């Protein structure tokens, strides 16, 4: 019993973190095999960030201008290239701690763990989600760039995020491990405002199923609804539309609890319309949307 | 910017987890040097849990009855002893991944990370706190016993908790690494009810300081108070009394924000009396109490 915002064990990722310095700029890099991946803005000064021409700034950089340190030992850079918004620094030594890994580009609503790092050293691990507006609500200070987001399937780490930027609103933007930003964000210190941060409906429903599995059942109502009627309410509350694909994904949670997906939608509809009335669900006074249906099944089943 | 419920990187602890089996009972153990620590209830059947006489049950167990597996390799048990509610299984091999470590007994209100494990394998990491009633609100399923709670000071892991039990209310009880339970709980399947789960006032105040540092300032009021007046309100709301020691501990957060501790107390007093009015603080609709003042300084400063 109990339900926590749980991150994946971070050991496999801690073994990959290195410090990357270019001139007077330092950030984190991810060392997998003989390649260190890091944000390309490691080549920028604070002034360059205002309007950087990365290809031009990179002409002034050679392999020896990128200092890669793993622990307290220096790695030898034998090649470098820019792929979208990341640099790939080829080193002469394969990371002996390289786990089984994949690079994946996640969809909005998908969750992942972040290992926040400073100077190549891990400081903490937390769970977050790719928001529907393609920002993430992380916890990052200056120097955290290059920290990564990931999921683990038994022994394989699927890297899905690399931290690059903080918007003026305190939310975060980054790329997948091929250097493509999530959403419309750019690695330039310019006016970039995020769109509506809508609530991830399928994740709220999954967390309401977790609440029923853990004994919090007060919100279960006597009603049902349809996807169309539910979505009319979801639109009004800035919740993402629920599709039949989301209903299919919630199937196993529906079977475990015996609560039909549309009945849970009707319970969610009443919670949106009536509020919580000072009550809590799994220790929260708001509807939590950063647990996917897969996360709920994993946490409630004990997948290692 | 941003403020997350952040756990310590779990790698150093993942390297210590092993599976311990005694007969048909399996749980997790912690392998440090040449000793594996685990809950003594690994010797019990489901029936024994109702009224176990551990000393008597242990007479029927020899070193070869405790199966310790690290990964997919078996460790040789050369000694065993019971210390309070834990068994210490001496093995012939020192854990090569033993980090620098200490065993500490924490006070209520103190936070720590938990590495939830099943069959000696890590499944997730989350942050929690020792409640004022000496329970913890974890996320544990059957088989999670022996999972540990810890804090990290740079390279030294201070182990503070080992999971043993779930109360009928879904909250958790466990011991320090010397086998002494936190609070009045026992490793027996009997009527054990938790006391009042009061709110950890000093931690709420620390989290209100984190909110001000991160830009959430709406709740800052035009008032101040005294410890005595504040505590009259705290008592009414089942909040722990605030002492001058808590005020001293909040000193650095007071200096960083320029908000006197008693002014923040007055703001907290108004939030308790008026409610949130549908507003949020750091993405929460309730007052968060599982961040200590040290956690806030660490997260807002970037300690690795
Ligand atoms: N140091 C490089 C960089 C960075 O780390 N950004 C940040 C990323 N995340 C959280 C931050 C929290 C406070 C401060 C900066 C943060 C990225 C490139 O553009 C900039 C531009 C300005 C500044 Cl002051 C920093 C940066
Ligand atoms: N298997 C041993 C043990 C255990 O793991 N307990 C649990 C601890 N934490 C979370 C649990 C969530 C569901 C179930 C049990 C949980 C501890 C000893 O006493 C008992 C007694 C009964 C049962 Cl059914 C299990 C146990």
Swiss-Prot record, chains A, B:
The cross-link described as Glycyl lysine isopeptide (Lys-Gly) (interchain with G-Cter in ubiquitin) comes at 5, 90
Q: In terms of domain of life, where is this protein from?
A: Viruses
Residues forming the catalytic site: 41 (for 3cl-pro activity), 145 (nucleophile)
Q: Which residues lie on this side of the membrane: Cytoplasmic?
A: 1-304
Residue ranges of domain Peptidase C30 in the record: 1-304
Q: Where in the cell is it found?
A: Host cytoplasm; Host Golgi apparatus; Host nucleus
The listed outcome for residue 49 to A is: Does not affect ability to cleave and inactivate human TRMT1
Impact when changing residue 205 to V: In strain: Zeta/P.2
Modes of activity regulation: Inhibited by pyridone-containing alpha-ketoamides compounds 13a and 13b. In turn, alpha-ketoamide 13b (tert-butyl (1-((S)-1-(((S)-4-(benzylamino)-3,4-dioxo-1-((S)-2-oxopyrrolidin-3-yl)butan-2-yl)amino)-3-cyclopropyl-1-oxopropan-2-yl)-2-oxo-1,2-dihydropyridin-3-yl)carbamate) inhibits SARS-CoV-2 replication in human lung cells. Inhibited ex vivo by michael acceptor inhibitor N3. Inhibited ex vivo by compound 11a and 11b.
**Record's catalysed reaction(s):** TSAVLQ-|-SGFRK-NH2 and SGVTFQ-|-GKFKK the two peptides corresponding to the two self-cleavage sites of the SARS 3C-like proteinase are the two most reactive peptide substrates. The enzyme exhibits a strong preference for substrates containing Gln at P1 position and Leu at P2 position
Complex and partners: 3CL-PRO exists as monomer and homodimer. Only the homodimer shows catalytic activity. Interacts with host FBXO22; this interaction promotes the proteasomal degradation of nsp5.
Protein task: Cleaves the C-terminus of replicase polyprotein at 11 sites. Recognizes substrates containing the core sequence [ILMVF]-Q-|-[SGACN]. Cleaves and inactivates human TRMT1, preventing tRNA guanine(26)-dimethylation of tRNAs. May cleave human NLRP1 in lung epithelial cells, thereby activating the NLRP1 inflammasome pathway. May cleave human GSDMD, triggering alternative GSDME-mediated epithelial cell death upon activation of the NLRP1 inflammasome, which may enhance the release interleukins 1B, 6, 16 and 18. Also able to bind an ADP-ribose-1''-phosphate (ADRP).
Protein name per its UniProtKB record? 3C-like proteinase nsp5
Per the UniProt record, the source organism is: Severe acute respiratory syndrome coronavirus 2
* Positions spanned in the full protein: 3264 to 3567 of 7096
